[PDB]
Design an enzyme around this catalytic site. Structure first.
Site, PDB file in Angstrom:
ATOM      1  N   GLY A 122     -39.658  -3.290  29.545  1.00  0.00           N
ATOM      2  CA  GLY A 122     -39.701  -2.865  28.159  1.00  0.00           C
ATOM      3  C   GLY A 122     -38.335  -2.435  27.664  1.00  0.00           C
ATOM      4  N   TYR A 141     -46.989  -5.578  21.821  1.00  0.00           N
ATOM      5  CA  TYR A 141     -47.923  -4.542  21.424  1.00  0.00           C
ATOM      6  C   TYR A 141     -48.990  -5.185  20.549  1.00  0.00           C
ATOM      7  CZ  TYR A 141     -44.213  -1.244  22.938  1.00  0.00           C
ATOM      8  OH  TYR A 141     -43.263  -0.545  23.663  1.00  0.00           O
ATOM      9  N   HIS A 169     -40.505   9.898  18.822  1.00  0.00           N
ATOM     10  CA  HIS A 169     -39.657   9.728  19.983  1.00  0.00           C
ATOM     11  C   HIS A 169     -38.316   9.095  19.618  1.00  0.00           C
ATOM     12  CE1 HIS A 169     -41.401   5.749  19.512  1.00  0.00           C
ATOM     13  NE2 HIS A 169     -40.432   5.280  20.283  1.00  0.00           N
ATOM     14  N   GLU A 182     -35.427   6.445  21.750  1.00  0.00           N
ATOM     15  CA  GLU A 182     -35.619   5.479  22.824  1.00  0.00           C
ATOM     16  C   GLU A 182     -35.166   6.068  24.150  1.00  0.00           C
ATOM     17  OE1 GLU A 182     -37.327   2.499  22.455  1.00  0.00           O
ATOM     18  OE2 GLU A 182     -37.658   3.468  20.526  1.00  0.00           O
ATOM     19  N   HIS A 192     -38.320   8.181  15.487  1.00  0.00           N
ATOM     20  CA  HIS A 192     -39.253   7.445  14.647  1.00  0.00           C
ATOM     21  C   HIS A 192     -40.698   7.619  15.101  1.00  0.00           C
ATOM     22  CE1 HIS A 192     -37.746   4.890  17.894  1.00  0.00           C
ATOM     23  NE2 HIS A 192     -38.926   4.300  17.893  1.00  0.00           N
ATOM     24  N   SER A 202     -40.923  -6.038  21.349  1.00  0.00           N
ATOM     25  CA  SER A 202     -39.738  -5.189  21.313  1.00  0.00           C
ATOM     26  C   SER A 202     -39.048  -5.004  22.665  1.00  0.00           C
ATOM     27  CB  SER A 202     -40.096  -3.810  20.762  1.00  0.00           C
ATOM     28  OG  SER A 202     -40.693  -3.025  21.768  1.00  0.00           O
TER      29      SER A 202
HETATM   30  C1  LIG Z   1     -47.476   9.487  28.616  1.00  0.00           C
HETATM   31  O1  LIG Z   1     -47.057   8.741  27.477  1.00  0.00           O
HETATM   32  C2  LIG Z   1     -46.557   7.462  27.731  1.00  0.00           C
HETATM   33  C3  LIG Z   1     -45.995   7.202  28.989  1.00  0.00           C
HETATM   34  C4  LIG Z   1     -45.491   5.934  29.246  1.00  0.00           C
HETATM   35  C5  LIG Z   1     -45.548   4.938  28.267  1.00  0.00           C
HETATM   36  C6  LIG Z   1     -46.117   5.205  27.014  1.00  0.00           C
HETATM   37  C7  LIG Z   1     -46.210   4.095  25.999  1.00  0.00           C
HETATM   38  C8  LIG Z   1     -45.180   4.174  24.871  1.00  0.00           C
HETATM   39  O2  LIG Z   1     -45.362   4.869  23.873  1.00  0.00           O
HETATM   40  N1  LIG Z   1     -44.031   3.403  25.038  1.00  0.00           N
HETATM   41  C9  LIG Z   1     -42.964   3.354  24.072  1.00  0.00           C
HETATM   42  C10 LIG Z   1     -41.661   3.757  24.430  1.00  0.00           C
HETATM   43  C11 LIG Z   1     -40.633   3.641  23.533  1.00  0.00           C
HETATM   44  C12 LIG Z   1     -40.897   3.123  22.253  1.00  0.00           C
HETATM   45  O3  LIG Z   1     -39.836   2.914  21.469  1.00  0.00           O
HETATM   46  C13 LIG Z   1     -42.175   2.742  21.872  1.00  0.00           C
HETATM   47  C14 LIG Z   1     -42.432   2.340  20.504  1.00  0.00           C
HETATM   48  C15 LIG Z   1     -43.652   1.812  20.143  1.00  0.00           C
HETATM   49  C16 LIG Z   1     -43.761   1.266  18.869  1.00  0.00           C
HETATM   50  C17 LIG Z   1     -45.000   0.546  18.548  1.00  0.00           C
HETATM   51  O4  LIG Z   1     -46.167   1.070  18.977  1.00  0.00           O
HETATM   52  O5  LIG Z   1     -45.067  -0.495  17.937  1.00  0.00           O
HETATM   53  C18 LIG Z   1     -42.706   1.339  17.946  1.00  0.00           C
HETATM   54  C19 LIG Z   1     -41.534   1.994  18.383  1.00  0.00           C
HETATM   55  N2  LIG Z   1     -41.392   2.465  19.627  1.00  0.00           N
HETATM   56  C20 LIG Z   1     -43.222   2.854  22.796  1.00  0.00           C
HETATM   57  C21 LIG Z   1     -46.621   6.477  26.737  1.00  0.00           C
HETATM   58 MN   LIG Z   2     -39.443   3.450  19.695  1.00  0.00          MN
END
Ligand SMILES: COc1cccc(CC(=O)Nc2ccc(O)c(-c3cc(C(=O)O)ccn3)c2)c1
Ligand SMILES: [Mn+2]
Ligand SMILES: [Zn+2]
Length: 351
Positions: free
Chosen positions: A167, A174, A185, A187, A273, A285
């Site tokens: 990732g 997604y 969060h 990145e 974001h 992504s």
């Molecule tokens: C205990 O909580 C968790 C532990 C491990 C992984 C995850 C999943 C996650 O949110 N992954 C993630 C990590 C970084 C990101 O930038 C995005 C994300 C997700 C989106 C989206 O859902 O489209 C948009 C922007 N960013 C998603 C959650």
């Molecule tokens: Mn993100």
């Protein structure tokens, strides 16, 4: 010089031509020369001439190995989102559920209408999110903005260590449905992010300018004192949702934007974001970097309560691109302060 570019730190939208769109890293430097990074998030509409896949009509048997049911708890703008892992599922199964009457998008006119229904019904009828699926939906022959191989200096990780971080230097898909969310969060290692919405209903985004990031953390630490004491960066747990009214009430500047099918979103280092999907859809992504990221990477505060979390060794970056600071850095004497307004060095040819 740079403090005069995009002084409102508003989200900007770009419409490159095909010649501009051919080279990814240069276009990023270009939008930074325009101050896009100050918003923390930017939209880039690719030319009508372009497509990463001929047809998506052949993907219904693709497996979602680990679907997530999103259970949200909390009230009045402050929420904690718990994950319930469900059994593996196919896209066709996912589509049926998403489109079913129980889980489907409610009727609405303006986006503001859907925004209100999301923040009022967030904790009811928990939806399923097909997140973090390994893979790409690009044809192998597309050389423009290919999320699987963007050729930025982030490649230095794999190149000199062999390490792949799912990732982060590989793509994620997604599959969203109505009311599926991503929490506040930045990145991993405060890298850049790029998101492409292949098809379906829109995805809305909130963002806080990197220069006000600390204000959002201060607010979060105040609302979740327990979490704040247990972890040095609890927002990287991706569980915390905070409504725009709440942000307004406490004077955090933010902006919001809606991403429609066929559009890219870029997030910038230390840009917080969050958002939610409007209905069934599918996004791809990955993370990437520029020379400007390196200093963010050196200063990123990581999660300190889980061993699973993502940590990239900064050493190789500081040797190759900041050699004169290496002894200082490795000895703990690099007191460099970050200016969120300066564009990456690669932008020199545009200024
Ligand atoms: C205990 O909580 C968790 C532990 C491990 C992984 C995850 C999943 C996650 O949110 N992954 C993630 C990590 C970084 C990101 O930038 C995005 C994300 C997700 C989106 C989206 O859902 O489209 C948009 C922007 N960013 C998603 C959650
Ligand atoms: Mn993100
Ligand atoms: Zn933690």
């Amino acid at each position: 010089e740079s403090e005069t570019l995009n002084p409102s730190a508003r989200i900007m939208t770009f419409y490159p031509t095909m010649e501009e769109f051919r080279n990814f890293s240069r276009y990023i430097a270009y939008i930074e020369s325009q101050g896009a990074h100050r918003a923390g998030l930017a939209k880039v509409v690719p030319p009508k001439e372009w497509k990463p896949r001929a047809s998506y009509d052949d993907i219904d048997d693709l497996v979602i190995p680990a679907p997530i049911q999103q259970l949200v708890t909390g009230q009045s703008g402050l929420f904690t989102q718990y994950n319930i892992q469900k059994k593996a599922m196919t896209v066709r199964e996912f589509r049926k559920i998403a489109n079913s009457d129980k889980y489907c998008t409610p009727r609405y006119s303006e986006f503001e209408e859907l925004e209100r229904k999301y923040w009022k019904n967030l904790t009811f009828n928990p939806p399923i999110y097909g997140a973090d699926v390994n893979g790409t939906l690009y044809e192998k022959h597309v050389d423009e903005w290919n999320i699987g191989r963007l050729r930025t200096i982030l490649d230095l990780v794999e190149k000199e260590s062999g390490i792949t971080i799912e990732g982060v230097n590989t793509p994620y898909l997604y599959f969203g449905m109505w009311k599926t969310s991503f929490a506040w969060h930045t990145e991993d290692m405060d890298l850049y992010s790029i998101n492409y919405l292949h098809f379906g209903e829109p995805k809305s985004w909130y963002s806080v300018p990197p220069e006000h990031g600390k204000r959002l953390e201060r607010l979060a630490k105040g609302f979740f004192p327990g979490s704040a004491q247990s972890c040095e960066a609890f927002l990287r747990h991706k569980m915390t949702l905070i409504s725009p009214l709440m942000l307004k009430k406490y004077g955090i500047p933010f902006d919001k934007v809606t991403q429609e099918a066929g559009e890219f979103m870029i997030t910038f280092p230390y840009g917080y974001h969050a958002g939610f999907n409007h209905g069934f859809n599918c996004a791809e992504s990955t993370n990437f970097a520029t020379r400007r990221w390196i200093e963010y990477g050196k200063q990123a505060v990581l999660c300190s309560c889980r061993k699973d979390m993502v940590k990239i060794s900064m050493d190789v970056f500081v040797r190759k691109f900041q050699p004169e600071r290496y002894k200082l850095w490795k000895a703990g004497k690099d007191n460099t302060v970050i200016d969120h307004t300066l564009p990456t060095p690669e932008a020199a040819e545009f200024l």
